[PDB]
Amino acid sequence: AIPRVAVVVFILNGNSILLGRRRSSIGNSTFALPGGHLEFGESFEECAAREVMEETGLKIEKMKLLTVTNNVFKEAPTPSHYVSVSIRAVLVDPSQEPKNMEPEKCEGWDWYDWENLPKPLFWPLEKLFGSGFNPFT
Amino acid sequence: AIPRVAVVVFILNGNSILLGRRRSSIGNSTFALPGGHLEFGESFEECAAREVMEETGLKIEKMKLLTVTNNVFKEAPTPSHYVSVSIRAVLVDPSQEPKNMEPEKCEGWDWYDWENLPKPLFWPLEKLFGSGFNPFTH
Amino acid sequence: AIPRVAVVVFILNGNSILLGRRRSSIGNSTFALPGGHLEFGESFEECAAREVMEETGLKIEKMKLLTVTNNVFKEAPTPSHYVSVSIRAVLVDPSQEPKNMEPEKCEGWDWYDWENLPKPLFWPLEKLFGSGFNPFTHG
Amino acid sequence: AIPRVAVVVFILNGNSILLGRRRSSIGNSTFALPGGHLEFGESFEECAAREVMEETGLKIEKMKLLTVTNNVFKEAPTPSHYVSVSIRAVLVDPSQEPKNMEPEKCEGWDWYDWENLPKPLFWPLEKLFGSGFNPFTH
Numbered sequence A: 001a002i003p004r005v006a007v008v009v010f011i012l013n014g015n016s017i018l019l020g021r022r023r024s025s026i027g028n029s030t031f032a033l034p035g036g037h038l039e040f041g042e043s044f045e046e047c048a049a050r051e052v053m054e055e056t057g058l059k060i061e062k063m064k065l066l067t068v069t070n071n072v073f074k075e076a077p078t079p080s081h082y083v084s085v086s087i088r089a090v091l092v093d094p095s096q097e098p099k100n101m102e103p104e105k106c107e108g109w110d111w112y113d114w115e116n117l118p119k120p121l122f123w124p125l126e127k128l129f130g131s132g133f134n135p136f137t
Numbered sequence B, D: 001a002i003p004r005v006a007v008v009v010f011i012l013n014g015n016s017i018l019l020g021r022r023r024s025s026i027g028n029s030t031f032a033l034p035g036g037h038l039e040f041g042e043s044f045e046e047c048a049a050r051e052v053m054e055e056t057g058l059k060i061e062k063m064k065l066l067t068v069t070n071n072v073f074k075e076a077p078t079p080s081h082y083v084s085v086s087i088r089a090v091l092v093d094p095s096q097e098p099k100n101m102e103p104e105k106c107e108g109w110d111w112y113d114w115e116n117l118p119k120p121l122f123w124p125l126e127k128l129f130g131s132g133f134n135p136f137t138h
Numbered sequence C: 001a002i003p004r005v006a007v008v009v010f011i012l013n014g015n016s017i018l019l020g021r022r023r024s025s026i027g028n029s030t031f032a033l034p035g036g037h038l039e040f041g042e043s044f045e046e047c048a049a050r051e052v053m054e055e056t057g058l059k060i061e062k063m064k065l066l067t068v069t070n071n072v073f074k075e076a077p078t079p080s081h082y083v084s085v086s087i088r089a090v091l092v093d094p095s096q097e098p099k100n101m102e103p104e105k106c107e108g109w110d111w112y113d114w115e116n117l118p119k120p121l122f123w124p125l126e127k128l129f130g131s132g133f134n135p136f137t138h139g
């Protein structure tokens, strides 16, 4: 077991971000970001665009590195350790709506207002927000 | 082959940072930061202090996250991909001097002024500095 | 697989361009330009006029190079990578209407006004326009 | 045979571009740009950076698409057809010296002033300049 690299994407649309409830043995039914695992030779931005396309069908642009978090899941059915790179992006077409391309992993994607976020948030995301992190600013 | 996580440490001492020439198959003879590979369950700060201890003997404190870089070495003898978390830290004892504690991996560690950095810098470090990154004020 | 060269044609007619919905494993039912694959020894302009003739029956002239785009489809049924040369052209006979000469690749061709383009556009086209590219005024 | 994509790079340094005489069955001994063949999945910029590193060791940045040319070599020993994407770039470190990293394919790289270009230029490059193309102002 070694740390693995993930990229998660804050897709900003107006005052909203895209979230969807996980179907997973880690954080089941909590609201999480679209994201994926970084592949050998891939840039953060190439991974962000690929994962978002794979999971939601959405086309994004104007990507920007935000931060990196250390996310250890000790009590998981298989304990895992992710180092997660956060990327901000916006839609190429602001009217494009997400599709649930991987329903085995997610209940569906929807837009949530920064001032009315749902609960429960996936703990890595809740923890990051609790630190004062704001993807818009 | 998959991306692996490293932590690299800017040890800030006055106006200087610690650098040492690599003895390595990647970036041989270039000036680089002390650093290490993140272990399972380890925090960024724990890895930074441990790697600096292992390589230099220096005791550091007040670790703070600076940024993250993507460093691919496809044409290396062994293709490697590192995601590198940069950490800022200071000496617990500002009079402590570095030792070359892993002398097979580094020619020796010394302090370099921010305004008189040595050449050649390890390419990931040169690339990061070329973006305007400054570890003292970031 | 290796990158392959395509030529795509912006046929400018008044304020309109020619588009048609693809019948394809890639970008199915999205609006795209007439175009074709560059043949060995062929010029961009020859490719543009030939592909437009083959797909639409239209006769074009005054071909001019616009730009080049890199379009990778790693997740297609068959992963593909195209390098697409954009060409501007006009009708030799402005009254000539397109025909759906290759109905296996396209639902049909129509003229669409630059300020009222249809949706959904084929993703390479949407991406190019998103950059501010305008075939009428480019260059 | 099928058209194949190349990328060629105008590395701008002051008023100069990098050129080197080809050792090749096509355009032998003529002055040409660093470049390479586009790989499946690669962006134009990734190819430009990779090819320049492979051939010269130089690190480049600020890459921009310039134009595209159609370069048919019917008279070649193996007739070839290249579609060549021109990319503008600059050095990360303007003091970095080129190396002749593939000395079987190039006699050596040097910087040439825009107002004193060498002869004979590789015909695809000569022909492009003959149209009035200028990589500094495009």
Ligand SMILES: CC(C)=CCC/C(C)=C/COP(=O)(O)OP(=O)(O)O
Binding pocket: A006, A007, A008, A024, A025, A026, A033, A035, A036, A037, A069, A071, A080, A082, A084, A122, A124, A125, A128
């Ligand atoms: C700050 C944030 C939001 C960090 C995200 C943490 C993360 C990548 C968890 C693993 O998710 P996963 O679904 O990729 O792992 P698995 O498929 O193994 O459950």
Ligand SMILES: CC(C)=CCC/C(C)=C/COP(=O)(O)OP(=O)(O)O
Binding pocket: B006, B008, B024, B025, B026, B033, B035, B036, B037, B069, B071, B080, B082, B084, B122, B124, B125, B128
């Ligand atoms: C200044 C920056 C961004 C450095 C990050 C790049 C990096 C971790 C290279 C590998 O070093 P390594 O010595 O830990 O790996 P290896 O011994 O396998 O070559």
Ligand SMILES: CC(C)=CCC/C(C)=C/COP(=O)(O)OP(=O)(O)O
Binding pocket: C006, C008, C024, C025, C026, C031, C032, C033, C034, C035, C036, C037, C071, C080, C082, C084, C122, C124, C125
């Ligand atoms: C028509 C337009 C706007 C094209 C832009 C870019 C592009 C990838 C063309 C290739 O499509 P193709 O149909 O020629 O290739 P394939 O048949 O393999 O899908």
Ligand SMILES: CC(C)=CCC/C(C)=C/COP(=O)(O)OP(=O)(O)O
Binding pocket: D006, D008, D024, D025, D026, D033, D036, D037, D069, D071, D080, D082, D084, D122, D124, D125, D128
């Ligand atoms: C200045 C311009 C427009 C150059 C483009 C022309 C070109 C790609 C020639 C082939 O180079 P190559 O060295 O890759 O050919 P080969 O390897 O087949 O000998």
